[PDB]
Amino acid sequence: MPAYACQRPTPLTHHNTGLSEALEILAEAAGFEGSEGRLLTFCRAASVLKALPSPVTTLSQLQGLPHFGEHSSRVVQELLEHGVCEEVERVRRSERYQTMKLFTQIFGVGVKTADRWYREGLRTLDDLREQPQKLTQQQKAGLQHHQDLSTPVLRSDVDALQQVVEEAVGQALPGATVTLTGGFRRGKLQGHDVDFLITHPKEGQEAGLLPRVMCRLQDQGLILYHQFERSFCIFRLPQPGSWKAVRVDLVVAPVSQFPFALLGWTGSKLFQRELRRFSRKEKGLWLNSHGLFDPEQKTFFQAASEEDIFRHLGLEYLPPEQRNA
DNA sequence: CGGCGTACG
DNA sequence: GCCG
Ligand SMILES: [Cl-]
Ligand SMILES: [Cl-]
Ligand SMILES: [Mn+2]
Ligand code: NA
Ligand code: NA
């Protein structure tokens, strides 16, 4: 079992679901307290279990697994022995965890904002609605739409959204393409949002594209909220006899960068962090969603495919469905 | 012990 | 919290 998540296939569904979910609670709680190192270890330990070929049934099976030390092993031991880990359950029922989760789930609210509100004594969404002087326009939209945004986006919703995005993109720039990215490209059947990557086969033609796309979606009445090359929108999605609000991310990249943007926007989030960590620490190359830089030669690697990028990093290729770290 | 992804709005 |  290799130490980096980008070195091993991680399927969407696996054989250690309960154990990984427990460790991810502790990771999330660590993030709410600003403990980013402990968040990473618990995330990585959870991800290792996702990559295993069968269920962990005994503590000895953790021997030699990366990112399992005293703490993560004790969590697993307690779950194996009793079906519950007291620390995890303590976190789950705690007022701090529940409120930080509630608040950071709001579009426009991060950990720092949630924490300040928590310290001011705020606890519920209606507490926030009762003091709207303290909210940004983005937060106001996130609160207004919070119920709809809490409802899973389904794969059926995705195909409808892609068609309307392609229509606007085609008028904004004939020949431009729309690619589904994010969790749905990794095979997820539900999500929190839908992610699209837009490019054009003629380098440079994509410049200035996203404003033109957004203007056209707005004129079709499809945009409930928007604020360039990245857009974090709330879309009006038709429903039987009604509609619902859905978060949609639109991203534009030049075709020269498209493999890097596709890789970067297909995730998972942990997979990308691990991939960039691997690139820099093990290969001495700097990776982002625009390119891959050799800081000795001061040159950028040209990639024509995700396969190219995995090869340039010395990694076996993983299809999107195996990047569910 | 230092390090822990890396961008854009 | 864990790795190197
Ligand atoms: Cl930490
Ligand atoms: Cl980036
Ligand atoms: Mn998204
Ligand atoms: Na948020
Ligand atoms: Na997504």
Short mmCIF file of C-alpha atoms (C1' of nucleotides) and ligand atoms in Angstrom, two decimals:
data_model
loop_
_atom_site.label_atom_id
_atom_site.label_comp_id
_atom_site.label_asym_id
_atom_site.label_seq_id
_atom_site.Cartn_x
_atom_site.Cartn_y
_atom_site.Cartn_z
CA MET A 1 0.00 0.00 0.00
CA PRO A 2 1.76 3.16 -1.23
CA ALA A 3 1.82 6.23 0.98
CA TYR A 4 0.24 8.71 -1.49
CA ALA A 5 -3.37 8.41 -2.61
CA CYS A 6 -2.43 9.12 -6.25
CA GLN A 7 -0.34 5.92 -6.27
CA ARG A 8 -3.27 3.55 -5.77
CA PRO A 9 -6.74 3.04 -7.29
CA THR A 10 -9.56 4.19 -5.02
CA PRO A 11 -13.03 3.15 -6.20
CA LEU A 12 -16.17 5.04 -5.32
CA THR A 13 -17.62 2.18 -3.33
CA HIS A 14 -15.46 -0.06 -1.21
CA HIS A 15 -15.23 -2.54 1.67
CA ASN A 16 -14.59 -0.34 4.72
CA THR A 17 -17.34 2.26 4.49
CA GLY A 18 -18.11 2.51 8.20
CA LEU A 19 -14.47 2.76 9.24
CA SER A 20 -13.67 5.44 6.67
CA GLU A 21 -16.75 7.47 7.61
CA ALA A 22 -15.68 7.50 11.27
CA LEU A 23 -12.19 8.77 10.44
CA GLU A 24 -13.67 11.39 8.16
CA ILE A 25 -15.78 12.71 11.06
CA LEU A 26 -12.57 13.26 13.00
CA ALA A 27 -10.97 14.88 9.96
CA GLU A 28 -13.89 17.26 9.55
CA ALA A 29 -13.84 18.15 13.25
CA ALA A 30 -10.12 18.84 13.05
CA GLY A 31 -10.78 21.26 10.18
CA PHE A 32 -13.40 23.10 12.20
CA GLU A 33 -10.69 23.71 14.81
CA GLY A 34 -8.06 24.80 12.28
CA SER A 35 -5.95 21.65 12.80
CA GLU A 36 -5.07 21.14 9.16
CA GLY A 37 -2.32 18.59 9.85
CA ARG A 38 -4.62 16.29 11.80
CA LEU A 39 -7.35 16.78 9.17
CA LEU A 40 -4.90 15.51 6.55
CA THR A 41 -3.81 12.45 8.52
CA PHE A 42 -7.38 11.41 9.26
CA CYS A 43 -8.39 12.02 5.61
CA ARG A 44 -5.41 9.99 4.38
CA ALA A 45 -6.07 7.17 6.84
CA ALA A 46 -9.70 7.01 5.72
CA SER A 47 -8.58 6.97 2.10
CA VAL A 48 -6.21 4.05 2.71
CA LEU A 49 -9.15 1.95 3.90
CA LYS A 50 -11.12 2.90 0.80
CA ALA A 51 -8.26 1.43 -1.28
CA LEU A 52 -8.15 -1.94 0.49
CA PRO A 53 -9.41 -5.02 -1.37
CA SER A 54 -11.54 -6.38 1.49
CA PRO A 55 -12.87 -5.44 4.93
CA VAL A 56 -10.60 -4.82 7.90
CA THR A 57 -11.77 -7.31 10.54
CA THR A 58 -8.82 -7.39 12.95
CA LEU A 59 -6.43 -4.76 14.26
CA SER A 60 -3.42 -6.68 12.93
CA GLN A 61 -4.56 -5.88 9.38
CA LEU A 62 -3.60 -2.23 10.03
CA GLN A 63 0.05 -3.16 10.59
CA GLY A 64 2.21 -1.57 7.95
CA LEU A 65 -0.59 0.54 6.47
CA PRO A 66 0.49 4.15 5.93
CA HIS A 67 -1.13 6.89 8.01
CA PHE A 68 -2.28 4.50 10.76
CA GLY A 69 -0.69 5.33 14.08
CA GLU A 70 -1.86 5.16 17.65
CA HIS A 71 -4.90 7.41 17.24
CA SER A 72 -6.38 6.16 13.95
CA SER A 73 -5.71 2.55 14.97
CA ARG A 74 -7.55 3.06 18.28
CA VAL A 75 -10.56 4.48 16.45
CA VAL A 76 -10.67 1.38 14.24
CA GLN A 77 -10.08 -0.95 17.20
CA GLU A 78 -13.05 0.51 19.07
CA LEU A 79 -15.30 0.25 16.02
CA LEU A 80 -14.26 -3.39 15.49
CA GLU A 81 -14.74 -4.25 19.17
CA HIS A 82 -17.94 -2.31 19.95
CA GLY A 83 -19.43 -0.98 16.70
CA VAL A 84 -18.92 2.60 17.94
CA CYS A 85 -15.98 4.87 18.79
CA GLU A 86 -16.61 7.05 21.83
CA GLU A 87 -14.54 9.96 20.51
CA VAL A 88 -16.40 9.92 17.20
CA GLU A 89 -19.78 9.82 18.90
CA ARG A 90 -18.74 12.63 21.24
CA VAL A 91 -17.85 14.78 18.23
CA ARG A 92 -21.10 13.89 16.46
CA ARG A 93 -23.40 15.07 19.24
CA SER A 94 -21.33 18.11 20.20
CA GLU A 95 -22.88 21.55 19.76
CA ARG A 96 -19.64 22.83 18.26
CA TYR A 97 -19.45 20.18 15.54
CA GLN A 98 -23.15 20.32 14.63
CA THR A 99 -23.21 24.11 14.38
CA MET A 100 -19.91 24.43 12.50
CA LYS A 101 -21.16 21.79 10.05
CA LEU A 102 -24.48 23.63 9.65
CA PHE A 103 -22.82 27.00 9.08
CA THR A 104 -19.94 25.92 6.82
CA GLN A 105 -22.45 24.06 4.62
CA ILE A 106 -23.84 27.49 3.68
CA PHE A 107 -22.60 28.80 0.34
CA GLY A 108 -20.53 31.88 1.23
CA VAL A 109 -19.62 30.73 4.76
CA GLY A 110 -16.23 29.19 5.55
CA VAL A 111 -14.70 27.90 8.77
CA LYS A 112 -13.48 31.34 9.84
CA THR A 113 -16.91 32.92 9.42
CA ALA A 114 -18.75 29.99 11.04
CA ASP A 115 -16.36 30.06 14.00
CA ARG A 116 -16.87 33.78 14.62
CA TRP A 117 -20.64 33.33 14.47
CA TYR A 118 -20.34 30.36 16.84
CA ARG A 119 -18.34 32.47 19.29
CA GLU A 120 -20.92 35.27 19.02
CA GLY A 121 -23.48 32.74 20.24
CA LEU A 122 -25.24 32.03 16.94
CA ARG A 123 -26.49 28.47 16.47
CA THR A 124 -29.24 28.16 13.81
CA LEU A 125 -30.00 29.34 10.30
CA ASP A 126 -32.82 31.46 11.66
CA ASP A 127 -30.31 33.11 14.01
CA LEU A 128 -28.52 34.20 10.84
CA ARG A 129 -31.67 35.28 9.04
CA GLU A 130 -32.64 37.48 12.02
CA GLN A 131 -29.42 39.55 11.61
CA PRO A 132 -29.06 39.97 7.83
CA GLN A 133 -27.04 43.16 8.26
CA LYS A 134 -24.12 40.84 9.01
CA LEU A 135 -24.38 38.85 5.74
CA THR A 136 -22.78 39.25 2.36
CA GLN A 137 -24.86 39.06 -0.80
CA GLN A 138 -23.29 35.65 -1.44
CA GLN A 139 -24.27 34.49 2.04
CA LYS A 140 -27.77 35.88 1.62
CA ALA A 141 -28.18 33.78 -1.53
CA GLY A 142 -26.72 30.72 0.17
CA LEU A 143 -29.15 31.10 3.06
CA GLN A 144 -32.19 31.75 0.85
CA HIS A 145 -31.38 28.69 -1.28
CA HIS A 146 -30.02 26.56 1.54
CA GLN A 147 -32.85 24.02 1.60
CA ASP A 148 -32.67 23.34 -2.15
CA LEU A 149 -28.88 23.27 -2.03
CA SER A 150 -29.08 20.63 0.71
CA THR A 151 -30.99 18.27 -1.65
CA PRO A 152 -28.77 15.85 -3.64
CA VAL A 153 -28.25 16.66 -7.29
CA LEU A 154 -29.08 13.55 -9.29
CA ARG A 155 -27.51 12.25 -12.48
CA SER A 156 -30.82 13.05 -14.24
CA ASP A 157 -30.43 16.67 -13.21
CA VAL A 158 -26.94 16.71 -14.71
CA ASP A 159 -27.93 15.86 -18.29
CA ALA A 160 -30.59 18.60 -18.31
CA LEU A 161 -28.11 21.18 -17.02
CA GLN A 162 -25.46 20.15 -19.55
CA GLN A 163 -27.85 20.70 -22.43
CA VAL A 164 -28.74 24.23 -21.33
CA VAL A 165 -25.06 25.07 -20.72
CA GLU A 166 -24.11 23.78 -24.17
CA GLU A 167 -26.82 25.92 -25.77
CA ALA A 168 -25.50 29.10 -24.14
CA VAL A 169 -21.87 28.14 -24.83
CA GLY A 170 -22.68 27.48 -28.50
CA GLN A 171 -24.10 30.98 -28.97
CA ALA A 172 -21.30 32.61 -26.99
CA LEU A 173 -18.65 30.85 -29.08
CA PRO A 174 -19.43 28.34 -31.84
CA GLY A 175 -17.17 25.32 -31.56
CA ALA A 176 -16.70 25.58 -27.82
CA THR A 177 -17.12 22.35 -25.87
CA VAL A 178 -18.54 21.49 -22.47
CA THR A 179 -17.10 18.62 -20.41
CA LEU A 180 -18.68 17.21 -17.23
CA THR A 181 -16.10 17.13 -14.44
CA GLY A 182 -16.11 16.84 -10.64
CA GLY A 183 -17.66 13.95 -8.77
CA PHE A 184 -20.04 12.95 -11.55
CA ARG A 185 -17.10 12.30 -13.86
CA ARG A 186 -15.74 9.95 -11.13
CA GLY A 187 -19.00 7.99 -11.36
CA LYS A 188 -20.94 9.51 -8.48
CA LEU A 189 -24.70 9.12 -8.76
CA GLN A 190 -25.44 12.19 -6.62
CA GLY A 191 -23.65 15.39 -5.76
CA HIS A 192 -23.80 18.80 -4.08
CA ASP A 193 -23.29 20.59 -7.40
CA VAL A 194 -22.42 20.08 -11.05
CA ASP A 195 -19.02 20.98 -12.51
CA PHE A 196 -18.37 21.84 -16.14
CA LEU A 197 -15.14 22.60 -18.00
CA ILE A 198 -15.36 24.66 -21.19
CA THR A 199 -12.72 25.10 -23.90
CA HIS A 200 -12.35 25.67 -27.63
CA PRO A 201 -10.09 23.72 -30.03
CA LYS A 202 -8.48 26.94 -31.35
CA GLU A 203 -6.04 28.25 -28.74
CA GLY A 204 -7.00 31.74 -27.66
CA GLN A 205 -10.60 31.68 -28.86
CA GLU A 206 -11.70 30.92 -25.29
CA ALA A 207 -10.51 34.32 -24.05
CA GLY A 208 -13.41 36.39 -22.70
CA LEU A 209 -15.81 33.47 -23.01
CA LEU A 210 -17.28 33.10 -19.56
CA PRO A 211 -18.92 36.57 -19.32
CA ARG A 212 -20.58 35.89 -22.65
CA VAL A 213 -21.83 32.53 -21.40
CA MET A 214 -23.09 33.99 -18.15
CA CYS A 215 -24.90 36.85 -19.90
CA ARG A 216 -26.76 34.38 -22.08
CA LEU A 217 -27.74 32.08 -19.24
CA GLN A 218 -28.95 35.12 -17.30
CA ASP A 219 -31.06 36.26 -20.26
CA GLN A 220 -32.72 32.85 -20.40
CA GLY A 221 -33.77 33.32 -16.74
CA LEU A 222 -31.68 30.37 -15.56
CA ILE A 223 -29.38 32.16 -13.11
CA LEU A 224 -30.61 32.65 -9.59
CA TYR A 225 -27.21 33.85 -8.39
CA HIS A 226 -23.78 34.65 -9.74
CA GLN A 227 -20.92 37.00 -8.91
CA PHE A 228 -13.16 35.88 -15.24
CA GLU A 229 -12.54 32.14 -15.80
CA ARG A 230 -14.41 30.42 -12.92
CA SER A 231 -18.07 31.03 -12.07
CA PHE A 232 -19.82 29.69 -8.95
CA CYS A 233 -23.51 29.90 -9.91
CA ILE A 234 -26.90 28.94 -8.55
CA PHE A 235 -29.05 27.73 -11.46
CA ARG A 236 -32.79 27.37 -11.77
CA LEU A 237 -33.36 23.73 -12.71
CA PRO A 238 -36.83 22.73 -13.99
CA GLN A 239 -38.75 20.18 -11.93
CA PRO A 240 -42.21 18.68 -12.51
CA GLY A 241 -44.57 21.62 -12.07
CA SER A 242 -41.84 23.73 -10.49
CA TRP A 243 -38.05 24.04 -10.21
CA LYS A 244 -35.21 23.84 -7.75
CA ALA A 245 -32.00 25.75 -7.16
CA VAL A 246 -28.78 23.89 -8.05
CA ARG A 247 -25.15 24.90 -7.60
CA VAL A 248 -23.19 24.83 -10.88
CA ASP A 249 -19.49 25.59 -11.37
CA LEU A 250 -18.33 26.75 -14.79
CA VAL A 251 -14.64 26.81 -15.65
CA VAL A 252 -12.91 27.94 -18.87
CA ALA A 253 -9.45 26.83 -19.92
CA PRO A 254 -7.41 27.19 -23.10
CA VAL A 255 -7.10 23.91 -24.97
CA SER A 256 -3.32 23.84 -24.26
CA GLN A 257 -4.19 23.61 -20.54
CA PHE A 258 -7.30 21.44 -20.87
CA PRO A 259 -5.70 18.17 -19.64
CA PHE A 260 -4.44 19.95 -16.52
CA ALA A 261 -7.79 21.59 -15.92
CA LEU A 262 -9.67 18.34 -16.50
CA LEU A 263 -7.37 16.51 -14.07
CA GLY A 264 -7.61 19.31 -11.54
CA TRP A 265 -11.40 19.61 -11.70
CA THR A 266 -12.12 15.85 -11.71
CA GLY A 267 -10.79 15.37 -8.18
CA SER A 268 -11.26 14.04 -5.66
CA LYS A 269 -10.11 16.94 -3.53
CA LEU A 270 -7.82 14.67 -1.52
CA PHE A 271 -6.58 13.02 -4.73
CA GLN A 272 -5.53 16.43 -6.12
CA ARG A 273 -3.77 17.49 -2.90
CA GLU A 274 -1.93 14.17 -2.82
CA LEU A 275 -1.09 14.39 -6.52
CA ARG A 276 0.34 17.89 -6.15
CA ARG A 277 2.19 16.86 -2.97
CA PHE A 278 3.64 13.85 -4.80
CA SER A 279 4.65 15.93 -7.80
CA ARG A 280 6.53 18.49 -5.73
CA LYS A 281 8.00 16.30 -2.99
CA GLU A 282 8.85 13.15 -4.96
CA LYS A 283 9.42 14.52 -8.48
CA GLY A 284 10.43 18.15 -7.87
CA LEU A 285 7.73 19.39 -10.27
CA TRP A 286 5.05 21.98 -9.48
CA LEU A 287 1.52 20.96 -10.50
CA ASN A 288 -1.65 23.01 -10.74
CA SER A 289 -4.77 23.17 -12.88
CA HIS A 290 -2.90 25.17 -15.54
CA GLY A 291 0.24 23.13 -16.03
CA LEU A 292 3.22 21.26 -14.67
CA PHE A 293 6.42 23.25 -14.11
CA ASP A 294 10.02 22.08 -13.87
CA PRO A 295 11.66 24.73 -11.64
CA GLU A 296 15.19 23.65 -12.59
CA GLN A 297 14.78 23.95 -16.38
CA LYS A 298 12.10 26.62 -15.90
CA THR A 299 9.90 24.86 -18.44
CA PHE A 300 6.27 23.72 -18.62
CA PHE A 301 5.33 20.20 -19.69
CA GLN A 302 3.04 20.09 -22.69
CA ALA A 303 0.28 17.59 -22.13
CA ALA A 304 -2.24 16.39 -24.66
CA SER A 305 -4.08 14.08 -22.24
CA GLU A 306 -4.45 13.15 -18.60
CA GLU A 307 -2.52 10.02 -19.55
CA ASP A 308 0.40 12.32 -20.52
CA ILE A 309 0.36 13.92 -17.08
CA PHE A 310 0.40 10.62 -15.18
CA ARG A 311 3.29 9.49 -17.39
CA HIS A 312 5.28 12.68 -16.79
CA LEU A 313 4.93 12.11 -13.03
CA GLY A 314 5.93 8.44 -13.20
CA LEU A 315 2.52 7.24 -11.98
CA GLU A 316 0.35 4.46 -13.35
CA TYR A 317 -2.70 5.97 -15.04
CA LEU A 318 -5.89 6.03 -12.97
CA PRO A 319 -9.22 6.62 -14.70
CA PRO A 320 -11.56 9.10 -12.96
CA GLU A 321 -13.52 6.26 -11.34
CA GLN A 322 -10.35 5.23 -9.47
CA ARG A 323 -9.55 8.76 -8.15
CA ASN A 324 -12.14 8.59 -5.34
CA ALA A 325 -9.56 9.14 -2.61
"C1'" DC B 1 11.76 18.67 13.78
"C1'" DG B 2 9.20 20.66 9.24
"C1'" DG B 3 5.69 19.70 6.32
"C1'" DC B 4 1.10 19.17 5.16
"C1'" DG B 5 -2.22 21.78 -2.72
"C1'" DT B 6 -2.79 25.37 -5.23
"C1'" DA B 7 -5.29 28.13 -7.59
"C1'" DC B 8 -9.22 32.08 -8.78
"C1'" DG B 9 -13.55 35.56 -7.30
"C1'" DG C 1 -1.62 12.86 13.32
"C1'" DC C 2 1.49 10.95 10.99
"C1'" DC C 3 5.77 10.63 7.71
"C1'" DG C 4 10.43 10.94 6.49
CL CL D 1 -2.97 20.07 13.15
CL CL D 2 -5.01 25.46 -9.80
MN MN D 3 -18.31 22.37 -8.09
NA NA D 4 -19.62 27.14 2.87
NA NA D 5 -18.76 18.92 -7.58
#
